[PDB]
Design a protein around this ligand. Structure first.
Ligand code: AMP
Ligand code: MG
Ligand code: MG
Lengths: 163, 156
């Protein structure tokens, strides 16, 4: 009665705001979501985002480029916020990622009631299980969907252990 | 050695920014920090913050009221960032808390080298230990004290 969703976001954060570039979400059932916001300003991107994140984004004709309102709607459907399953959000650390995701609904008060107010942290789980040796980091390091997938992979390894 | 800090914040957030009202930090050794920012704008507070948060704040002439720079400097001292301690940060449902804390320094890349880039989620630990029974308002130092209390019970 509970579905885990593994997510990662890319963004531009300056100490004041967090402007969403992209989000990838993978459910443990094989479903995938990925989108790139049409509303972030590429000029604001720092040097590191300009070289590592932006070049990996889809061509501007791609239907993966969506408005923020559209991404919100897409996520309400993808997370099945009106279905009977409870939702568990998982990310490597949450924090900035959780806020970026949740800001798609505006303030904290506006988040759909079934969306958890916290993200479970894979990093904490990994450490809780004695820091198992893990597979190496994939090649497309800063693509949000590739990242999310890899997080589901690691979650399965960490939890499918003998313990 | 490793030192755990438990913290909580109050703020005004509007889906874009997080304007820090106050922060409370408690170390495992018993040390406590609390401050209220002289830089948030109470006019911008929603009705919920107006009624539950602001009236719990100290009177205006209390030296608990500090600038954002003073709070940053206060925290670098309280967390002992110049020492050889390793630091763990812990909060309960703390995604926005972690951002609020980090924004005291700027982007997260401005964080001092020894402060961790993530805050451990006390609610995840709780559920991982089988959701043991925890005891029984929106004052950040009282909240932070209470997280340590719960941590000690969860790990007892
Ligand atoms: N029921 C609520 N309505 C509006 N904002 C809230 C609510 N609960 C928590 N918050 C926000 O999250 C911050 C942290 O809350 P707390 O640590 O629960 O005292 C508050 O300063 C509020 O801005
Ligand atoms: Mg990320
Ligand atoms: Mg709190």
């Amino acid at each position: 009665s509970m579905v885990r969703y593994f997510y990662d976001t890319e963004f531009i954060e300056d100490g004041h705001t967090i402007e969403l570039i992209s989000i990838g979400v993978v459910a443990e059932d094989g479903r995938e979501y990925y989108a790139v916001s049409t509303e972030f300003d590429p000029e604001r991107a720092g040097s590191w985002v300009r070289t590592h994140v932006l070049p990996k984004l889809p061509p501007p004709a791609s239907q993966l480029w969506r408005s923020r309102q559209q991404i919100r709607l897409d996520l309400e459907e993808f997370l099945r916020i009106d279905g009977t399953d409870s939702i568990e959000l998982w990310a490597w650390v949450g924090a900035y990622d959780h806020v970026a995701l949740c800001q798609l609904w505006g303030p904290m008060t506006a988040l759909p009631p079934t969306v958890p107010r916290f993200t479970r942290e894979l990093r904490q789980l990994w450490e809780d299980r004695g820091c198992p040796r893990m597979p190496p980091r994939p090649r497309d390091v800063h693509d949000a969907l590739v990242d999310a997938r890899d997080q589901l992979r690691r979650f399965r390894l960490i939890t499918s252990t003998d313990d």
